[PDB]
Design a protein around this nucleic acid. Sequence first.
DNA 1: GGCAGAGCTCACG
DNA 2: CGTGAGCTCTGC
Lengths: 350, 347
Amino acid sequence: MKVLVNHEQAYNVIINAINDAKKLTDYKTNNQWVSIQNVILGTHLTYRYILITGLLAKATDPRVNPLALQANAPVDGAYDARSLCHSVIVGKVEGPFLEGKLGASNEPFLNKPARYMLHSSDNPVRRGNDKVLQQLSIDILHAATTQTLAYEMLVIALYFTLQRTNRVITPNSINFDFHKIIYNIISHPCDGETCAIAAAISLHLLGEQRGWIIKAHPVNQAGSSSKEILDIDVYHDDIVFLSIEVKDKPFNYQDVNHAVSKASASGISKVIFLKGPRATNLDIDESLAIENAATKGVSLSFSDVMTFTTTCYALSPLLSNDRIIDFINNTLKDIRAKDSTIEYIQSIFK
Amino acid sequence: MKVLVNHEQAYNVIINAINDAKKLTDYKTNNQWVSIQNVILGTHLTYRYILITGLLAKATDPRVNPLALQANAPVDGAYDARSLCHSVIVGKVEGPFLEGKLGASNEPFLNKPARYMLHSSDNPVRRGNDKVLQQLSIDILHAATTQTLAYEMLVIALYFTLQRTNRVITPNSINFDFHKIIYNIISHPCDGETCAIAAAISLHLLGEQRGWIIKAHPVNQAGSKEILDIDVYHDDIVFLSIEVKDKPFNYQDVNHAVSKASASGISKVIFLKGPRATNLDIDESLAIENAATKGVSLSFSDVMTFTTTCYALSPLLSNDRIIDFINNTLKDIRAKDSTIEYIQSIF
DNA sequence: GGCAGAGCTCACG
DNA sequence: CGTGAGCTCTGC
Ligand SMILES: [Ca+2]
Ligand SMILES: [Ca+2]
Ligand SMILES: [Ca+2]
Ligand SMILES: [Ca+2]
Ligand SMILES: [Cl-]
Ligand SMILES: [Cl-]
Ligand code: NA
């Protein structure tokens, strides 16, 4: 029998749970607390939302099955977990009460791990820590057999949520030099985010004085979105005059043509195609790609990410290290960088 | 159990199928043709790529199960259809031979309908017309029981693909092809002087509205207010010096350039490598680490990468004055008579 | 020549 | 009310 969870009640329940978490002293009351700590403080965004939503639902309505994700799941107490998460947690709670400390995802239940009828170990999962966190979060929800236990675990979960850090790099280093920072940032792929960050902060060095507005987008935002042309779009006088495609994996001529075509369809006449350290083994005829782009009205050029950063640095006026850190921090917020990216970059400044 | 579909064979099969489709006289020879028509002309992009790929795999390799989408599917003849579609259809075929008429997707097998082990009616789908197309594409693949039947249906599917329209409007060509200009300038080395010209005019394009002063110098003379081959001024101060090498060189030439910039208080040096700057022993990272201890940010770049990066960062307005940039550079580097001639033979 | 998932905007019925 | 299509990103 499917269930309708009352969204006004779930809102009141999670407000009370947050106020309790803000005064919580003994978080070791329930024996799921280590599992809850590891999921909430982990780097997997979607399992945080799934865990909070399941516990909230069961704390609000004892009829629900906390392992159900969709209303038509073939279990008793199935419910539409996506709508509870997006309307209450995303729409009303995480911003004002949690400072985006779950990750500030707009639609976490469209992420692949949430697009299932049940939160289940049958659901395919990336190997390694993601598979471990999948089982931990299943175990917690499976342990939430009463409203009271679910509420107890919800408070512990939000207590650990409130401990999470933001997307801010604090430079403990007295001073770093730009080239060494870039070199360490792009040595690890970090889901494609580090090469995009290196490209973005390099544009900031040259755009600072010319009034450029650099818009780097979340790397998992799709080219079909109206919110972007390519990976990074550069505005002067409210108009995109240059777009950048970054590749930190191997690419072929069709990848290039796909980016050129998106720029051509939006009337952007200059494109830079940047090859990160993993864009290797590429016998690709760049002059033919550039010729093809030219007929489509796009001026296309190529560069390694490292060469692009050192050339931007050499051409720019030198600004305080404080200003470079600002570029990094603003870019990390703009692309809603992942936890592992934040931790990796923070470790560079230590 | 998984089988491997040979991608090079699959390419030959679909090229043959496309040529057969382009001359097909009778598309009604297989009783799936109406279902094939409705899938290929339908509005569900991922079923189009699933259909084509599965028919391609079975036509290529008789061991395949055309309903398998993933190599680890628990059926005989499972295979990695994602990699077949992306490396053959997307990578090499749809654009050049089908005009993007499947949809011109770059990663269709990341689309949700493809992210299952098997193509089956268990998989999530919208009610209505998508539900029907799902069942039709399953039925076609289910009927592709032999190589011969799979090929025939593939040819029919491509025939209907060719009937779709891919309404993209062909823009006009770029007004200003900078890459061509630079390629033409540096195709002849002219004793390393065309590389200096290419680098200098790119700096002019970028600095015209930034208040830079570009001072290029004769490229094969170490004459004393000049630093390296090109000095860039902002506020009467050199902030960047460029050496333009279009012949072999070693780290003594690099350390010499770094030392002169250091001695003048220049902390940024670019070393440009022309097309003829070949047979290089240099550990570039070691040269860079040494220059840092002398207080110099050193970096390396191809002439072509550097010039086109400057242009990409430039305003479009600078393009009117490019011939002025070339003419001023020719004078400043005291170009040889044969160099002025080669440059004028282009503009 | 290995295989396939975590995230995201934009929807449909 | 309920939830899929299509598209980004290399990870393991
Ligand atoms: Ca399974
Ligand atoms: Ca992108
Ligand atoms: Ca990219
Ligand atoms: Ca034109
Ligand atoms: Cl966070
Ligand atoms: Cl839907
Ligand atoms: Na020289």
